[PDB]
Write a protein that binds this ligand. Structure first.
Ligand code: HEM
Ligand code: HEM
Ligand SMILES: Cc1cc(N)nc(CCc2cccc([C@H](N)Cc3cc(C)cc(N)n3)c2)c1
Ligand SMILES: Cc1cc(N)nc(CCc2cccc([C@H](N)Cc3cc(C)cc(N)n3)c2)c1
Ligand SMILES: C[C@H](O)[C@H](O)[C@H]1CNc2nc(N)[nH]c(=O)c2N1
Ligand SMILES: C[C@H](O)[C@H](O)[C@H]1CNc2nc(N)[nH]c(=O)c2N1
Ligand SMILES: [Zn+2]
Lengths: 403, 404
């Protein structure tokens, strides 16, 4: 059945028919929904994902059935028959990476899907080479605060060997140092990776915002450590437009959100190291990273600096402080001339995206629980929009940590 | 290892498996191909099957499964269904099933309170006038001068051939929505349709933003009849802000008693078409959705202007600031007036505790994440960080089509 999809603010109705093209089961069953879970609980098969993808591609450039389409399908058939695998042409890779982003149900930034700079790093044979690539990516994507979306794609997985991998989950991450006294100094989300870096030879700092080194690993080798040159790592000091004490808290965050541990799947080929970046939405930093209890957890501190009654929930001290902190992030990013989008502008743009996708493809897979921001949900138009979630390919997938 | 879904809390890093979901006898809207969790709204041997399960549920809740009273009550129920097509609940069965429908509601965050329901049995009711009296009594009991008490009143079950008992209003207290000669709405846009119906059926309308509506009550095979609630029974709270002295001058207000009137309570296959139930409010329902939704009272811009915020740009967070202050006004005004209310922090914290109780007691809790997480400050509340499994158990409250 093609599901009915209603927006309850405007009363408007669409039908998702794009979900028919999913070939990959999600976690839900008619007996129970698991859409709030973060993680999911032959060569004939490669060949049919390859065919489907090459069809996607020739259709995308309007040359379906053409000589070139039919010859390219033979190339792939011929290559899989003989080798159990194949290779994509740069133009295909580029179309695949764009379509992976477009298909990502948890991304609120997808109106930007077509504007993606793809660096082909498949000609890479060492951790050293990977580092050089990763550095040019940072330089490009950062662009002196005028951030630009980008992916760099490292060599695909092959049956006969270990994967290329970036052990870090993002390219820029702040150390979290566990204390004898149980507590964490720095970002508690990164304690395990910090410890791995120390163990593979890094000399640690002891600050709340020590930028971490990369652990890059080429196939079947121990990973290697590379420190990022600080001048490549753009950071923004947090201040508040009206509250002067705020700056004194010493808070900061990096400009560049670059995911580096997700697998990119194209035409049934898999790219284990394929880091990608855009720009931040303020709530990611101001609400989750700084206010989550199991992150920097700065909410009391701020609320105490604001002289708020902390002794009861019903004063809404938590809510008031979170708002100011999100404000600080937006103000400081603007002042520093680094790209940021607030959650209202972002969600407005995502509604426009659903609408473009409805005309173009007949649907947009989307994960309501990740699209609605972590503060002021019902204040944003997406709260009120029903959404259908399902897995199209090309796709970004979660993968297990390599250790 | 267990082939039950694993449920994780990402704040604390703890894990459970829901085994309760195995007792679901009714499919929801999702499939392996696509998840539809975010959508608001997607007899004979059959009844006998539902009734046996419910009776079995009753006998376990009192620890007599397999007992002689148990096998006899099963026998009574097949006998009654055999000779009439339906059967009837014992009083203590109705009490149990009503509580179990509340406990089973995936969308209710207030379920730590589920054991405390007062169940008014109104299965003797025989006219619309009598529904009115029962409803008035419900409101008086539940409101209790601001010290609110959970309650439900249960009217006669659906019967074959004979028509239903039905309350046409969706809630017992609702503000009028008056459609204007331009196209705007005065009052609550949510209630334009029931307003128009009240007027068609003979109600003389007001012209305020907060006109309390009358009730359209429908006894079997009869046209609905109209009943004005006496104003003294409808407790309202005028809204003011603790420090922003101008907020009181906006004349905003809300009623104390949240009381759903159009849901069907299903127990053991039996269908109670009129069974209104009431609790108390979580502040975000009033201060965020009812007052600030674009398609409700929509006051966010007005408040932001009073607060002097820059409304010409999203990145001032003018909406976020105004919403916070409205929510605080709601909490503050309810507290000052000694009317029970719970803020979104206390509610959600209570619901985590309920989850833990229910893990021990039943091996899971059906929960709808999009509804349980509040509409402001989501990730500041612990439920944001808690995975939830959603499924249908019975007894249940189910949505039903409007009677008209
Ligand atoms: C250009 C600006 C972009 C914005 C504002 C944006 C925004 C977001 C946000 C807010 C999330 C949720 C993140 C969280 O809660 O941790 C997200 C998730 C994601 N976005 Fe983006 N995005 C952007 C660009 C991109 C690009 C360039 C890619 C890939 C090429 C991408 C792929 C994803 C994916 C795969 C996720 C899911 C991550 C996960 O599952 O952990 N987005 N996006
Ligand atoms: C005692 C205090 C209670 C609180 C604070 C409370 C809180 C809530 C909240 C916040 C919602 C979401 C409503 C919305 O978004 O419009 C809700 C839904 C609901 N609650 Fe409660 N609840 C309470 C008592 C009750 C009682 C006594 C019943 C039934 C006996 C009940 C059954 C429900 C049901 C069925 C829904 C879903 C309604 C729908 O789908 O439209 N709750 N609850
Ligand atoms: C390109 C881009 C733009 C933007 N504005 N934001 C981002 C944030 C990305 C991000 C960062 C840290 C952690 C996670 C995710 N929380 C990491 C994660 C963990 C697990 C266990 C599962 C899963 N699916 N995901 C995702 C990326
Ligand atoms: C007892 C109780 C306590 C409390 N704190 N809050 C309430 C909220 C009541 C309520 C009111 C208006 C609209 C809806 C729901 N939005 C009404 C609705 C509409 C549709 C189409 C589907 C659906 N499932 N629901 C639900 C009840
Ligand atoms: C359990 C729940 O799914 C989990 O907390 C999700 C909720 N929604 C989210 N949404 C975004 N955008 N990012 C997140 O990390 C999460 N966490
Ligand atoms: C589209 C989406 O399902 C819808 O707007 C839901 C989201 N969560 C909600 N949650 C509650 N508690 N109440 C609601 O009315 C809604 N609306
Ligand atoms: Zn689902």
């Amino acid at each position: 059945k093609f599901p009915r999809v209603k927006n309850w603010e405007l009363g408007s109705i669409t039908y998702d028919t794009l979900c028919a093209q999913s070939q990959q089961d999600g976690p839900c069953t008619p007996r129970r929904c698991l859409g709030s879970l973060v993680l999911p609980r032959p060569a004939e098969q490669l060949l049919s994902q390859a065919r489907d993808f090459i069809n996607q591609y020739y259709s995308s450039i309007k040359r379906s059935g053409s000589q070139a389409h039919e010859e390219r399908l033979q190339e792939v058939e011929a290559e899989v028959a003989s080798t159990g695998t194949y290779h994509l042409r740069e133009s295909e890779l580029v179309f695949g990476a764009k379509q992976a982003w477009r298909n990502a149900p948890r991304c609120v930034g997808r109106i930007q899907w077509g504007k993606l700079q793809v660096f082909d790093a498949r000609d890479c044979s060492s951790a050293q080479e990977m580092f050089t690539y990763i550095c040019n990516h940072i330089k490009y994507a950062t662009n002196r605060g005028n951030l630009r979306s980008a992916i760099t794609v490292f060599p695909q997985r092959a049956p006969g060997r270990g994967d290329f991998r970036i052990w870090n989950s993002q390219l820029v991450r702040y150390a979290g140092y566990r204390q004898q006294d149980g507590s964490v100094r720095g970002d508690p989300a990164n304690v395990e990776i910090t410890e791995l870096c120390i163990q593979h030879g890094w000399t640690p700092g002891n600050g709340r915002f020590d930028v971490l080194p990369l652990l890059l690993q080429a196939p079947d080798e121990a990973p290697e450590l590379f420190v990022l040159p600080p001048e490549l790592v753009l950071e923004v000091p947090l201040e508040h437009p009206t509250l002067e004490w705020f700056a004194a808290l010493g808070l900061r965050w990096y400009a560049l959100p670059a995911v580096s541990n997700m697998l990119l799947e194209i035409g049934g080929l898999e790219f284990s190291a394929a880091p990608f970046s855009g720009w931040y939405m303020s709530t990611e930093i101001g609400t989750r990273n700084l206010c989550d209890p199991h992150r920097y957890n700065i909410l009391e501190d701020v609320a105490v600096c604001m002289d708020l009654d902390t002794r009861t929930t019903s004063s809404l001290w938590k809510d008031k402080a979170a708002v100011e902190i999100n404000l600080a992030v937006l103000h400081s990013f603007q002042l520093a001339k680094v790209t940021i989008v607030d959650h209202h502008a972002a969600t407005v743009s995502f509604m426009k995206h659903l609408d473009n996708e409805q005309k173009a493809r007949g649907g947009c897979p989307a994960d309501w629980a990740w699209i609605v921001p972590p503060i002021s949900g019902s204040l944003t138009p997406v709260f009120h929009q029903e959404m259908v979630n399902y897995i199209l390919s090309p796709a970004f997938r979660y993968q297990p940590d390599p250790w």
